[PDB]
Structure 1
Amino acid sequence: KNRAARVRVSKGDKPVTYEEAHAPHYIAHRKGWLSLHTGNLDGEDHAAERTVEDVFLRKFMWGTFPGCLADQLVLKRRGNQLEICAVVLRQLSPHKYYFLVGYSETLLSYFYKCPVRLHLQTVPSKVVYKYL
């Protein structure tokens, strides 16, 4: 019995989505990697820096867009430019959405001295994979 990146089976009255529904030994078989970079490949370096920085990205963005997200993010790093993809709920106003988007994007660009972009997909209610 191993407990790792898996949700306990409940009565069947709580939504669960694809990524946490599937096991961590199903990552490459039936999932995709959340972060996209080449530091893990051979010949590259700074993999520790990549991991720490992208973990900080995820933390800061999850906590600066609280209550609207319902799933993990998608990071896409093609050379210099960084891209983020999020799925959120239509809870708060588009005013707040755009304001926080611009604010956080400017902060990340200024901090990492790097071109950053981010996109968001609104959903009325978080898509459930199954009821476990």
Structure 2
Amino acid sequence: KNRAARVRVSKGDKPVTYEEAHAPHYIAHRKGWLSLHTGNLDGEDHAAERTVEDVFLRKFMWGTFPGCLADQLVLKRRGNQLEICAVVLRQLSPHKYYFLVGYSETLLSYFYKCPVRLHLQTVPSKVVYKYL
């Protein structure tokens, strides 16, 4: 039986998001990609470097906004601009979200030597697609 990236059926009490509810074979069919860049196009270079950067930013944001992320990050690269789009919860005070945005954008801009912007969308609670 296939296991990869499959949230398994339970008793009907486990809330899953839309991202979680779709196995890998639905990628490009029902669900899109969580990062968009040119490295994996034919004739393009530096796919390995974009992949390492993406893995770091996901770990970095998980621990920089601990308990606040309500879904996976969406990573967008245009030119040398890096856009991080995150769906977060509404528990932390707005002052802390502004501190962490200023801190994260600045720290990541100096780390990867590119202008980095963080876009936060807040939701009252994790959006539930279905109960498995």
Q: TM-score, normalised by structure 2?
A: 0.98
Please state how far the C-alpha of 1:14 moved relative to its aligned partner: 1.5
Once superposed, what is the RMSD of the aligned Cα atoms?
A: 0.7
Flag structure 1 segments of 5+ consecutive residues without an equivalent: none
> What is the total number of aligned residue pairs between the two structures?
132
Q: Which has the higher helix share?
A: 1
> What are the Cα deviations for residues 48-70 of structure 1, in whole angstroms up to 9, with x where unaligned?
11101111011101111010112
> What are the Cα deviations for residues 11-60 of structure 1, in whole angstroms up to 9, with x where unaligned?
00121011110010100111110010010011111111110111101110
Please state how far the C-alpha of 1:82 moved relative to its aligned partner: 0.8
SS in 1 for 2:83: strand
SS in 2 for 1:100: helix
SS in 1 for 2:105: helix
Match of 2:125 in 1: 125
Flag structure 2 segments of 5+ consecutive residues without an equivalent: none
| Separation in structure 2 between the aligned mates of residue 119 and residue 91 of structure 1, nearest angstrom | 17
Match of 1:68 in 2: 68
Q: TM-score, normalised by structure 1?
A: 0.98
Match of 1:87 in 2: 87
- Identity across matched positions, percent: 100
